[PDB]
Structures are given as structure tokens and as C-alpha cells.
Amino acid sequence: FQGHMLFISATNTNAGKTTCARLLAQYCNACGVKTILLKPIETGVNDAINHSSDAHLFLQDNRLLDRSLTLKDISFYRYHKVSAPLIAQQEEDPNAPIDTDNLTQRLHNFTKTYDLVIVEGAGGLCVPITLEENMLDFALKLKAKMLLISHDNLGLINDCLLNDFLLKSHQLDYKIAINLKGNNTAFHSISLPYIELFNTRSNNPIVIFQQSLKVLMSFALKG
Amino acid sequence: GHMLFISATNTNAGKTTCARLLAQYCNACGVKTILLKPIETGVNDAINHSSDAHLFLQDNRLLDRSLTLKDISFYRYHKVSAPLIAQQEEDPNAPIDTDNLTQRLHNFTKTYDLVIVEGAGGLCVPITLEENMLDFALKLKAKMLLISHDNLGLINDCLLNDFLLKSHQLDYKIAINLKGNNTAFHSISLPYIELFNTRSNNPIVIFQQSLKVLMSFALKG
Ligand SMILES: Nc1ncnc2c1ncn2[C@@H]1O[C@H](COP(=O)(O)OP(=O)(O)O)[C@@H](O)[C@H]1O
Ligand SMILES: Nc1ncnc2c1ncn2[C@@H]1O[C@H](COP(=O)(O)OP(=O)(O)O)[C@@H](O)[C@H]1O
Ligand SMILES: NCCCCCCCC(=O)O
Numbered sequence: 001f002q003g004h005m006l007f008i009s010a011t012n013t014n015a016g017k018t019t020c021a022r023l024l025a026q027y028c029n030a031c032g033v034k035t036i037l038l039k040p041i042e043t044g045v046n047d048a049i050n051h052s053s054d055a056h057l058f059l060q061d062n063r064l065l066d067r068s069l070t071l072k073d074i075s076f077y078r079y080h081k082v083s084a085p086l087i088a089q090q091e092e093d094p095n096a097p098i099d100t101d102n103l104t105q106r107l108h109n110f111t112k113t114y115d116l117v118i119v120e121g122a123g124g125l126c127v128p129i130t131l132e133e134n135m136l137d138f139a140l141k142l143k144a145k146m147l148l149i150s151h152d153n154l155g156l157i158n159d160c161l162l163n164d165f166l167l168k169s170h171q172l173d174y175k176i177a178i179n180l181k182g183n184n185t186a187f188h189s190i191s192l193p194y195i196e197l198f199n200t201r202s203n204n205p206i207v208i209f210q211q212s213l214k215v216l217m218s219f220a221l222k223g
Numbered sequence: 224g225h226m227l228f229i230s231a232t233n234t235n236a237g238k239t240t241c242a243r244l245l246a247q248y249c250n251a252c253g254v255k256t257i258l259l260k261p262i263e264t265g266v267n268d269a270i271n272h273s274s275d276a277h278l279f280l281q282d283n284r285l286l287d288r289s290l291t292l293k294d295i296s297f298y299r300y301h302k303v304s305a306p307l308i309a310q311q312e313e314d315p316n317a318p319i320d321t322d323n324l325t326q327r328l329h330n331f332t333k334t335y336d337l338v339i340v341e342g343a344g345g346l347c348v349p350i351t352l353e354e355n356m357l358d359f360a361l362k363l364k365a366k367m368l369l370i371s372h373d374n375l376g377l378i379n380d381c382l383l384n385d386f387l388l389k390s391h392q393l394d395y396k397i398a399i400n401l402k403g404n405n406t407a408f409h410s411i412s413l414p415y416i417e418l419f420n421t422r423s424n425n426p427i428v429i430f431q432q433s434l435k436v437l438m439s440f441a442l443k444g
């Protein structure tokens with residue numbers, strides 16, 4: 001068995017990566033698709049004090065599959081500073097640059113025992129991890145598939161398209177999904193019309209996450 | 224005259240404020256500078272007189288008192304949305320004409336040293352079925368000043384835009400709109416910018432610190 005890998009990134013931080021990741025994993029696992037959730041690099045955390053980081057939320061979902069799992073098993077580079085990882089690393093752990101080769105082995109390792117390995121990035125695509133590498137670079141090195149989450153507010157069109165432009169310029173499979181809040185009545189009149197229009201002319205349509213679980217599972221497992 | 228297009232990482236980033244600050248500086252230095260907002264959305268001119276165009280109008284009147292809103296802003300809609308969406312809903316029979324707009328903007332270069340043009344929202348914001356703000360800026364053969372917010376997340380937003388801009392044949396600069404009370408920026412984001420700048424031939428500057436530099440940029444041949 002060789003399992004599949006889905007990288008999850010976003011238009012920016014605080015866009016819905018974590019929530020959507022969980023929602024997708026939940027769906028997959030319910031359909032009998034054995035799915036683990038990973039947050040390899042995380043910043044803005046203090047694990048002595050609080051247990052509500054993305055890695056912690058992931059850990060508790062993952063433990064429904066493998067109770068022996070621990071935080072250190074699914075998250076590897078963790079910093080207090082609320083910043084890009086590179087900046088956090090340099091300040092808090094100067095002698096230990098983030099090793100993407102290491103990270104890759106570890107993420108791939110999970111594909112040996114899981115049908116689907118979901119990997120949450122940090123912040124957006126151009127967020128720097130090392131002197132030489134950013135999150136997009138990392139996703140490419142992993143040879144993973146890309147799910148890019150967008151916010152659902154005024155300004156999403158610009159953000160989606162900027163990211164579309166960057167992604168389509170690189171050799172990877174990707175989908176862009178909008179994280180639509182249920183109570184967001186404005187979206188369907190304000191943004192959705194351009195998205196519809198954009199989709200008629202694009203071979204890589206932008207979908208609405210909450211309405212695309214089945215479609216996105218398929219995408220994730222395609223090969 | 225010279226033409227500077229002003230866009231941003233997104234809407235509500237500081238285009239209007241920075242545009243005014245730059246015009247103010249220019250005009251003070253004897254560089255005759257007009258401020259234009261050709262396309263604007265989310266406005267209701269009967270009720271509210273604080274639109275970007277209105278602010279521009281009152282600045283512009285220090286140079287030419289006869290000027291009126293309709294002279295410096297041409298497509299204006301109530302809907303708080305991308306212009307294309309606003310147009311289709313509010314004025315279906317009148318697509319935005321970028322050829323027209325270009326004439327009208329260029330026209331001002333005849334009588335002004337510098338013509339500053341505020342876009343709407345960001346670069347990929349659609350104006351017509353075929354064209355977005357970046358397209359428009361290219362058609363204008365204008366120079367590009369892209370304003371960025373100063374918050375957590377600016378790196379990503381700056382670089383995304385850098386990527387898109389550097390992929391096209393235009394001169395541009397990216398300026399961070401740094402709030403004066405923003406102590407966090409200097410330790411949270413600035414380090415990466417400095418680092419980025421050491422390795423890029425198109426460094427990211429801090430707007431409030433770069434008025435003279437940006438004026439020069441705007442007037443360079
Ligand atoms: N559909 C939704 N309804 C309510 N809150 C949401 C929804 N999607 C995301 N959020 C909230 O918005 C915030 C975004 O954080 P997160 O899911 O961690 O995004 P990111 O991983 O991109 O930082 C969280 O507090 C989360 O609970
Ligand atoms: N450097 C700054 N310092 C303090 N307030 C600012 C600064 N730049 C913009 N603002 C304020 O924040 C808001 C940003 O809006 P604006 O400048 O119109 O953004 P945009 O033109 O990109 O939509 C305005 O209300 C403005 O007064
Ligand atoms: N009031 C200013 C609104 C300008 C257009 C909004 C940007 C659309 C988007 O990128 O989703």
C-alpha cells in the first residue's frame with residue numbers, strides 16, 4: 001500500500017486551513033478512508049500552557065484511529081513567536097534550521113500506514129520556512145497535491161486569483177476551495193458571481209469547500 | 224507627464240491614504256500632481272461625501288478649483304463589490320470601457336507633471352469580462368506602486384503580488400503602509416523583508432520612509 005498526500009494551504013493565515021482540514025478528514029474517515037492529520041510546522045504556540053494549537057486539535061482527531069499517538073509524532077517544529085517559521089526558528093532555535101528533507105521522510109512515512117495523509121502548512125504559500133524555501137517549495141518537494149483554502153469575504157477574488165496565478169505556474173495538482181461561513185448571506189451576491197464566471201472559463205474551477213467534500217476526497221485520492 | 228498607478232495587497236490596505244500623502248509631498252516639491260479614482264465601488268454620492276474620489280477632489284482643487292467629481296472619477300457604483308459585478312447589476316448596458324478610461328487618464332498628463340491613478344481593491348480585481356486592474360495598469364503603460372498592509376500575513380501577500388508583477392513587463396515598487404503605532408512589525412515581519420531585500424533587485428520599501436524615493440521612481444524615465 002502507498003497512500004496519498006494532501007497539502008493544505010491558504011490565501012493567508014486565519015483562513016480556515018485547520019477547520020477545513022478536520023472537516024475533510026472527518027468525512028474521509030467516515031467513508032472508510034483512513035486519514036491522518038499533520039501540522040509539521042507550527043508557530044505562535046506555547047505547549048506548556050495551552051493545548052488548543054492546530055497540532056492538538058489534530059492529535060485528538062487522529063487518536064480515534066491510533067490512540068498511541070502523541071503531539072511530537074504529528075508536529076515537529078514548534079515555536080512561541082507569532083510569525084513566519086523562518087523568523088521564529090532564527091530567534092528561538094538559531095542552531096537548528098528547519099530540515100525539509102527530514103520533514104519529507106516523516107510525512108511520507110505516514111503514507112505507508114494511512115490511505116490519506118493531510119498536511120497543514122502555516123499561513124500562506126509564500127511563507128518562508130528556511131533561507132531557501134517556502135511553504136509552496138515544501139509542498140512541491142513532498143510531491144503532494146494541493147488544497148488551497150480561501151476566506152469568504154470581500155477581497156477573496158483578488159486573493160484566489162493571485163494564488164491561482166502562482167499555483168498554475170508550477171508543476172502540481174491543486175484545487176482552490178472557499179471556506180464559506182454558513183451565516184454569510186452577502187457572499188452569494190458579492191463574490192460568487194465572478195467565481196461562477198471564472199469557472200466557466202477555467203479548467204481548474206474554484207469550488208465551495210463545504211459543498212465539495214465528496215469531490216475533494218476524490219481529488220485527494222486520484223492518481 | 225508621468226503616470227503612477229496605485230494598487231494594493233487588497234482593499235482597505237491604504238491606497239487612498241498613501242496616494243494622498245505622496246501627492247501632498249509631490250505638490251509641495253513643485254511637482255504638479257493630480258489624483259484620480261477612475262473606477263470606484265461601494266459609494267452613494269447622494270448621502271456620503273467621503274469616497275476616495277471626494278477626498279481626491281478636495282486635494283485636486285488646491286491646483287484647479289474648477290474640478291468636479293465627474294472629472295476625476297468615471298465609473299461609480301453603490302454595490303460593495305468588484306467593479307465588473309457592480310457594473311453588470313447596476314448598469315448592464317454599459318460595460319466599463321478601458322480604452323475610454325485610458326484616453327481620459329492620459330489626457331491629464333498633458334497638463335500635470337504627475338498623474339496618480341488609484342485602482343480598486345487589488346491587482347486581479349476584475350473590471351470587465353476580459354480585463355482586471357493589472358491589465359488596465361498595463362494598458363495605461365503606467366508605473367505601478369503596490370501598497371501593502373503592515374500586519375501579520377504581509378509577507379505572503381507581498382510575495383504573491385511580487386510574483387505576479389515580476390511576471391509582467393512593467394516597473395513596479397511594493398511599499399508597506401506602516402502605521403506609526405505599529406511596534407510589532409519591526410520584530411514580526413521586518414526581518415524577512417530585510418532578508419528578502421538583500422536577495423532581490425526590486426526591494427520592498429516602507430512607504431512612510433520613502434516619499435522622496437517614490438517621487439523619483441514615479442518621475443523616472
Ligand atoms: N465555517 C466556519 N464557521 C465558524 N468558524 C470558522 C469556520 N471556518 C473557520 N472558522 C474559524 O475561523 C478561525 C480560522 O482558524 P483556522 O481554522 O485555524 O484557519 P487557519 O488554519 O487558516 O489559520 C478559527 O477560529 C475557526 O474556528
Ligand atoms: N498609515 C496609516 N495610518 C493610520 N491610518 C491609516 C493609514 N493608512 C490608511 N489609514 C486608514 O485606514 C483606512 C484604509 O483605507 P484606504 O487608505 O482607502 O485603503 P484603500 O484605499 O486601499 O481601500 C482608512 O480609513 C484610512 O484613514
Ligand atoms: N469598496 C472597495 C471594493 C473594491 C473591490 C473588492 C475586491 C474584490 C475581491 O478581490 O474579492
Ligand SMILES: NCCCCCCCC(=O)O
Nearest residue numbers: 083084123376377378379
Ligand atoms: N500562526 C500563524 C502565523 C504563521 C503565518 C505567518 C505568515 C507570515 C507572513 O506572511 O507575514
Ligand SMILES: [Cl-]
Nearest residue numbers: 022026061064
Ligand atoms: Cl471528528
Ligand SMILES: [Cl-]
Nearest residue numbers: 243246247282
Ligand atoms: Cl494636502
Ligand SMILES: [Mg+2]
Nearest residue numbers: 017018019054
Ligand atoms: Mg491553522
Ligand SMILES: [Mg+2]
Nearest residue numbers: 238239275341
Ligand atoms: Mg481606497
